[PDB]
């Protein structure tokens, strides 16, 4: 009986909530009350990368911390040398409605996808003078919201159908499907160990997934509204979640619950994008209002604002060396930021 | 002053920027359109008629390129997505117009009113004008002439509603058909006029299932949308 199964699900939800509350020994704010504040993080736009015609919808940094891919709904996937502002590639997409792109850790490939329901994989190191499609991963039944390479052969993808999939790029097939979400999956972040990933969805839950087992380890459900953006904390033991509810929230895998929430009453715009700084001390969040707020991830206070955009910040990524944060926006500009001594 | 590798990188950047200039020209000369409508709406017959007259099963987006005079139109039909649209619809913030096709003959059209209200009031789709194709006008004519279903059962306002003197009926259509047509239109216009505040406009059109005028209708009211945008940025409207 579904009524009895619903009652058992309520019983297990109560048991889980009780186990969470038993682990709430003390809050993060209490533990970090006596750590020194981050202070005012002023950052300057060191580069404005201009050349996209439409709104930029996604970014990814290369592991080299120099090359940056950005996807715009004009149907150009542009690869930028951040140091020089030079455009290294501009790839004509077969569908303009790109919503995600990924840079492979090897730099050999970029992926992108969107309303085509396809993750197109682009070989950047062909003998040809221009980039070619290596593979078109065609099994999703909704829009590609995020994609992230595990390796040159494996890409995790998230979709508007409430499902992630792990793809073998050489075979072109789903090695695994991640089905437990109940709304549009909006964001992925791969753990640093690459074995776990967390995906946030319109259900307002985040879920932890094992790429090898194909199963949900944990569901995190503190958010009120759609989790537009998710980012692993660099230790791999916590992750931040941005939502339409205008809050970020920090979840720890092992505490199985919200450590902290980042919100200000003046912030009524949903979170579009989240990234940590290399130490994890800064949570950079992009907003529907044209700002990125830098949060002290330990103290939950606003260390600063990246105020340089003229439309919705769409994507936000810190280099793997932590040296710069790029910020794409619907203003078609791709602003790259760093501090000063 | 550049090293030979920096020189070759700048030369590649310049060739890419030249290609991006050419694609800026092609892109900015194209009117992008989002085609919305319930499965009962003849939006499929609209894409079919325009695909014929002018210019992978998981594929979540269908593009039909069509051309009117020299203006290129790319019209996008969102096919293989889920019923939840609130995220993917945000992609279309930039489109010149949304073509919202309504099955005027099916009094399920209160769902079409609710979808129109949502599209019209969304924070990312305000400033986008809606080309409202009140389709299946022939089926609506048959439906109201047969009299087996009556709009006041679905909209109590229709018992009071009187046809506006602005109405320009076809010479042969019955005044009951006109009153039904313009009531449906005026419900969509009620939604459009509640909250547009002049940032975006609704363009009702009465279309038959196949009606070759529709591409001209979209051309005319795209030209009107672009004129209104220009007048707005000149502060003249």
């Amino acid at each position, epitope marked *: 009986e579904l009524d009895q199964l619903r009652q058992e699900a309520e019983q297990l939800k109560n048991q889980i909530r009780d186990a969470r509350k038993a682990c709430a020994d003390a809050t993060l704010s209490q533990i970090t009350n006596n750590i020194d504040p981050v202070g005012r993080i002023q950052m300057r736009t060191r580069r404005t990368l201009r050349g996209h015609l439409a709104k930029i919808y996604a970014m990814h940094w290369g592991t080299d911390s120099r090359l940056l891919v950005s996807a715009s709904q004009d149907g150009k996937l542009i690869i930028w040398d951040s140091y020089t502002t030079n455009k290294v590639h501009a790839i004509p997409l077969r569908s303009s409605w790109v919503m995600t792109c990924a840079y492979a850790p090897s730099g050999n490939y970029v992926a992108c996808g969107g309303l085509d329901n396809i993750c197109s994989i682009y070989n950047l190191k062909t003998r040809e003078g221009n980039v070619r499609v290596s593979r078109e991963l065609a099994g999703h039944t909704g829009y590609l919201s995020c994609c992230r390479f595990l390796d040159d052969n494996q890409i995790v993808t998230s979709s508007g159908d409430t499902t992630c999939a792990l793809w073998d790029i050489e075979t072109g097939q789903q090695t695994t499907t991640f089905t437990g979400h109940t709304g549009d999956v909006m964001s992925l972040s791969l753990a640093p160990d690459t074995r776990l990933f967390v995906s946030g969805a319109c259900d307002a839950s985040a879920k932890l997934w094992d790429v090898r087992e194909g199963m949900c380890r944990q569901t995190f459900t503190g958010h*009120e509204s759609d989790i537009n953006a998710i980012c692993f904390f660099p230790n791999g033991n916590a992750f931040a979640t941005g939502s339409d509810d205008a809050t970020c929230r920090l979840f720890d895998l092992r505490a199985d619950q919200e450590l902290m929430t980042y919100s200000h009453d003046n912030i009524i715009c949903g979170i579009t994008s989240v990234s940590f700084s290399k130490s994890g001390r800064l949570l950079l969040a992009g907003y529907d209002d044209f700002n990125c707020n830098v949060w002290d991830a330990l103290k939950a206070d606003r260390a600063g604002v990246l105020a340089g955009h003229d439309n919705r910040v769409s994507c936000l990524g810190v280099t793997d060396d932590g040296m710069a944060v790029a910020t794409g926006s619907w203003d078609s500009f791709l602003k790259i930021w760093n501090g000063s001594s | 002053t550049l090293s030979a590798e920096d020189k070759a990188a700048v030369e590649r950047s310049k060739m890419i920027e030249k290609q991006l200039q050419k694609d800026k020209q092609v892109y900015r000369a194209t009117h992008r359109l989002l085609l919305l409508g319930a499965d009962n709406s003849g939006k499929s017959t609209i894409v079919k008629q325009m695909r014929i007259y002018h210019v992978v099963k998981t594929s979540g987006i269908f593009e039909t390129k069509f051309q009117v005079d020299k203006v290129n139109f790319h019209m996008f039909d969102v096919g293989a997505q889920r019923d939840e649209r609130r995220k993917w619809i945000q992609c279309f913030n930039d489109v010149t117009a949304i073509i919202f096709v309504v099955d005027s003959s099916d009094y399920r059209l209160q769902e079409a009113l*609710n979808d129109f*209200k*949502s599209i019209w*009031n969304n924070r990312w789709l305000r400033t986008i004008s809606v080309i409202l194709f009140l389709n299946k006008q022939d089926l609506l004519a048959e439906k109201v002439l047969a009299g087996k279903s009556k709009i006041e059962d679905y909209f109590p306002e229709f018992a009071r509603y009187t046809t506006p003197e602005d109405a320009t009926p076809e010479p042969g259509e019955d005044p009951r058909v006109t009153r039904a047509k313009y009531f449906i239109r005026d419900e969509f216009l009620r939604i459009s006029t509640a909250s547009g505040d002049g940032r975006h406009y609704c363009y009702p059109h009465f279309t038959c299932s196949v009606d070759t005028e529709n591409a001209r209708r979209i051309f005319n009211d795209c030209r009107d949308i672009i004129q209104r945008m220009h007048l707005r940025q000149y502060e003249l409207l």
Partner: nanobody
Amino acid sequence: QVQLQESGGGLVQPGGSLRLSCAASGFTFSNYKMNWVRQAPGKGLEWVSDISQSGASISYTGSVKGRFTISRDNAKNTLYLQMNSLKPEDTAVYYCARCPAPFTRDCFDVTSTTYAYRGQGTQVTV
């Protein structure tokens, strides 16, 4: 977590009256526009009424306009539907559906075949 729990639905004589009530938990209810949505057994899911953050804006379907009133007690995080003069047309599972985002009026997806911010629904038979 976001859970919506409708109550008060049951059998009623035609022309009878029921107050449905949803207890909302896990969100700042005051910030979200609220809806009632119903699925009659023979047809798809259909919207019924909506209420703004304050109740300053309210609307209904034409089946409902005079018969039902939607109201909210933001202090009790609870939404009501005073269904007067129920007809056999009104027999449906009634679902209370939150809007997706706070501070907004776009009402998207509340009628979707699956939607996260909607309760399990209360059966009303007339």
